[PDB]
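Supplementary material to the annual report.
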Amino acid sequence: MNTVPFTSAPIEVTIGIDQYSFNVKENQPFHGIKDIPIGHVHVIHFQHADNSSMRYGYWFDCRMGNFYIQYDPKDGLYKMMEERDGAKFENIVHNFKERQMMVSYPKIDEDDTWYNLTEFVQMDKIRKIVRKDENQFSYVDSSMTTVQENELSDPAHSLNYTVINFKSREAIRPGHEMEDFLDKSYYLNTVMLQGIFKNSSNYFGELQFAFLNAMFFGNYGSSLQWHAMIELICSSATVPKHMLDKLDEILYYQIKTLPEQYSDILLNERVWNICLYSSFQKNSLHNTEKIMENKYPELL
Amino acid sequence: GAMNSSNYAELFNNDIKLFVDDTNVYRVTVHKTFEGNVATKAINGCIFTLNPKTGHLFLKIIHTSVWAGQKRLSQLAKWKTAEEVSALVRSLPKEEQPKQIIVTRKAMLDPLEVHMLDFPNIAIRPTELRLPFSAAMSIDKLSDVVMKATEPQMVLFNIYDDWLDRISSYTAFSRLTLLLRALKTNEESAKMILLSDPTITIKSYHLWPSFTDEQWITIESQMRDLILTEYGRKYNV
Ligand SMILES: N#C[C@H](c1ccc(Br)cc1)N1CCNCC1
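Predicted assembly:
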């Protein structure tokens, strides 16, 4: 179990660590988060009390280095940093825990929620979507645009998700216009899975990272990416049985975790009604359809 | 975006454009079977593709053989329309290719956009107008070529005959829609109006009779009366 210490907390802020969150008051004696489970990616995120505009946060993996948070009063935010001096780091962390000014990552032992939301998410792939190679953690915020959003403006601060476009030459083979547009199996299995993602775990991992970006920072681009990846599967007549079964688990836990009050904006009515009730795969997402009908019957 | 009464003169500027109407592509007769069930029998159809500025009509005849052993024909028909339109565009020299294609029904937009992905600079557009292009199979010479065809076939016409020699493309277009609207609302009455006078003939290379300016005004008035009339007969007014 690992630790992300904080130098201090000079401004009042709501702090999130994965699906958990807590308030820190201005200059409260807060010095970070302990007992973070090793083996998963994590995200630590922030919303200032004074300006709820711009949620922001860092994706990270404690196996990849010693990371800490320090407020920057010039740039006005809590910044993730890496300590290369491993000795100095252990030294600082032990003092703060002895003085007990750290919150403990609050993992209930029956709870596999975080795992199931990040099963396929790999820090190496995150860093390819969020390009900033001098750091081993990745910054995201609410206003970052995707590579396709700029196609339709700063390329350095973009989310480089895999562009999916159902009305693109990539998606449509000359001579199968009707066939490939009504049954996207070619685009799913050959273009994206075999061509771009190589396997279904990488696809799913981008799918999961889009959803988390969408829910944790209200990143529209991520929401669009998450819905497109679902829709491409649901609209493909020919999908491996094992991807369908896993898709149903993935979405189930995503639907389960979503804030009830945010559902009206984070769930696209057209995509879900199509995926659950019209698409080739309308019969194939049993868990996902049961939770959506019992929790969000309005949207349908 | 879409095409309505507010950007109407756009049809007649010098940007090449075509209307596409798919209503007559897939046509059937419905009949009882020996066992007392109902079956359809397809009959030949046509894509109605029109340059509203020149009157050039690219009538692609849809032969019933193109449906043999196909399922979900009403859907295929939209994709077969798109494919024939896209083929037509590709057959034309670049400087004759349309800058826009306007579809009379919105269900054509996606089939056409997908077929025209090679032509990203051709705008595919819908329209809010209720255009009477479906009545095109009420033009005798057009219905005749369709019904006689024994194989796929493209036939070129000018749907304004020689009108542009005397009137503008706006007026010519307005005349055509008034004619086609009248044919759609009461075909018999419409045709009786156009042909009651044996002395006014239809030239071999034309679709409509050879009216004088004065005669066209009379005719145009009579089609307006017919369309207002049938609106009373229909609604009781
Ligand atoms: N309110 C809201 C929604 C929204 C916001 C965040 C996410 Br994630 C999904 C949809 N959008 C309003 C108009 N464009 C901006 C965003």
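The longest helix of chain A spans residues 200-217.
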